[PDB]
Design a protein around this ligand. Structure first.
Ligand SMILES: [Mg+2]
Ligand SMILES: [Mg+2]
Ligand SMILES: [Mg+2]
Ligand SMILES: [Mg+2]
Ligand SMILES: [Zn+2]
Ligand SMILES: [Zn+2]
Lengths: 357, 357
């Protein structure tokens, strides 16, 4: 059975969602916030965050329902949520307010673009951008998985002002995505996902085991250094729980898969994702444009969407339309590019030790 | 690499432990407390708890090193730890002080008895007692896995006095052990463990999936009801993280097993446990007596060790010596007894909803 707070139990009504979708979305949102932000003090901000996460959850598989262009507009209700009021409740008066408005809007924008019927030109630029370099992959995947957003929101929900540097967010996101994309590897290969680190680094278990071990070891060092402050724990709890949600949350298959993690995906799981079982989304193979959406983009994504075509790797394999054709759904790196990514991911420890002080 | 606080880095020296054992023990202890007690305010109590957990870790595979009879003695150092000073720091002035002295001492007593060369008569009485009824199994496994102890310690490490009722501890332990013993099922079958719920309930995946799903569902209900208080979260965090340590802690095999959970154990894992890889212990097939140890026993264990032989199930299969002969190592329930256990574990939801209000 699904459990969530009475405050939200009448949310998302009269929206175009069935009763079964509506209760699964509210439960997913609650369970994600609980797992990623286990320590909090401010219930008003916490529930506003859960509501923003319910809207994220809708965007992640039924993007057509979500009016991306009204998310940051004062007074606009999106599926009954006053989105900008919720973001102001969570972040107004913090040092990351403006950046997190862009982070949230940019996330749902490419959630909805990826979960659209017909692939837009803007969506194609995104899919080619996240394959352009491992550092770019990590920064754009941060927004897509809301890693820095959850870390900042967690601090905000303890009535503190997040004080992380840019290089601190970047180190933290690389650690968390290295772990999460490893656990999600078979889920994501079933979704014909573009957004998985190992779609670009390569699919050999040896590499995945190695960099998973290094990421979890760096995260234990970080936990040991940071566990005595509320901001430190806010960060630790999000990162450490990213890989663990596959066992703790009903969004995932631990029970249905016979109490296992890490069994390769089957065409059965492919069809489950297509039919939105656990609110998954299979990307099978333009209306929004750069010009219409660029106000909501954080700087690195705005740059990523305008990369000079003359500097794109020609030995990497592109497609006219991305997604599943019945693997991963995006660019296939050439051996030179793939070695650049594997090198970058293997050099994490030295990079992170520097960035994290 | 292994990470733990500078405070403990010179612990457990000149003890009969190698440098490799010593650093693995300190890391295990730190990682367990971090995972089970992620939210705390009192660093002095926290570090005292980590030290008590380091001593637990020694008892769990090399019990011969641990002088059980000096654990509760004021002024006694056990492997360099002032055990009673540490317990007083953690629990003196709480409502559970006396019960937790008995809980800790009783735990390490049967850790050391189970991890002994020659099986004692007292150890044989324990192994037959935990197979006597599912309720008795759960209460004695609570102490063995330190479930109520960790929950009470967590509250204590937030400078609060644990206020849980006896039926609250019992509900919480059944939830946590139902989850933990399921994830540990293959580890434990490799250890020829006696202390696994499914050794008694039966080994069919269907049953395990069902009761795992019910336990995790009840725990999400409990989290949703209790998450707004520090005592509530203290309880939630321990229970929810029990099954997850198999992915988060280096004590476990997630990385070495190719980033998987739930692959059946092999004779290779059996030999790993025997050779104490990750500080595991294989029980392969009397000096301490009831009279010498009964001062440290909590009431239900003192009763369990004196059960009338006339009331033991004769259709259950006992052995002169327990442990591996190259499965689970204890009593094998008869079909009548096994159905009593499966019935009890399937009736958890109604039992827990009552006990938890
Ligand atoms: Mg997704
Ligand atoms: Mg996504
Ligand atoms: Mg054990
Ligand atoms: Mg044990
Ligand atoms: Zn290339
Ligand atoms: Zn019987």
């Amino acid at each position: 059975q699904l459990h969530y707070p009475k405050e939200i139990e009448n949310d998302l009504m009269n929206c175009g969602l069935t009763e079964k979708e509506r209760v699964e979305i509210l439960a997913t949102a609650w369970e994600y916030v609980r797992c990623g932000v286990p320590e909090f003090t401010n219930w008003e901000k916490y529930i506003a965050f859960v509501r923003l996460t319910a809207l994220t959850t809708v965007a992640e598989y039924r993007g057509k329902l979500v009016d991306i262009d009204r998310l940051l507009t004062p007074g606009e209700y999106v599926l009954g949520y006053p989105v900008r009021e919720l973001l102001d409740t969570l972040f107004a008066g913090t040092s990351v307010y403006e950046a997190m408005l862009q982070e949230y809007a940019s996330c749902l924008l490419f959630m909805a673009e990826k979960t659209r019927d017909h692939q837009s030109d803007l969506c194609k630029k995104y899919i080619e951008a996240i394959a352009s370099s491992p550092s770019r992959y990590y920064r754009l995947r941060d927004c897509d998985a809301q890693v820095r957003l959850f870390i900042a929101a967690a601090v905000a929900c303890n009535d503190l002002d997040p004080d992380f540097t840019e290089m601190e967010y970047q180190a933290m996101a690389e650690i968390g995505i290295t772990l999460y994309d490893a656990v999600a590897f078979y889920k994501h290969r079933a979704e014909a996902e573009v957004s998985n680190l190992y779609a670009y680094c390569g699919q050999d278990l040896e590499f995945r085991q190695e960099v998973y071990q290094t990421a979890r070891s760096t995260l234990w060092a970080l936990e040991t250094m940071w566990c005595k402050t509320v901001q430190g724990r806010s960060a630790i709890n999000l990162l450490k729980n990213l890989p663990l949600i596959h066992m703790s949350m009903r969004r995932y298959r631990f029970v249905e898969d016979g109490l296992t993690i890490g069994k390769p995906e089957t065409s059965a799981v492919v069809r489950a994702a297509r039919n939105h079982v656990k609110l998954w989304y299979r990307n099978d193979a333009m209306e929004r444009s750069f010009e219409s959406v660029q106000y909501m983009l954080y700087p690195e994504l705005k740059e990523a969407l305008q990369l000079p075509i003359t500097e794109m790797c020609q030995k990497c394999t592109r497609r006219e339309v991305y997604g599943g054709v019945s693997q991963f759904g995006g660019v296939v790196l050439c051996k030179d590019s793939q070695e650049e990514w594997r090198h970058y991911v293997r050099s994490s420890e030295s990079r992170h030790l520097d960035w994290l002080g």
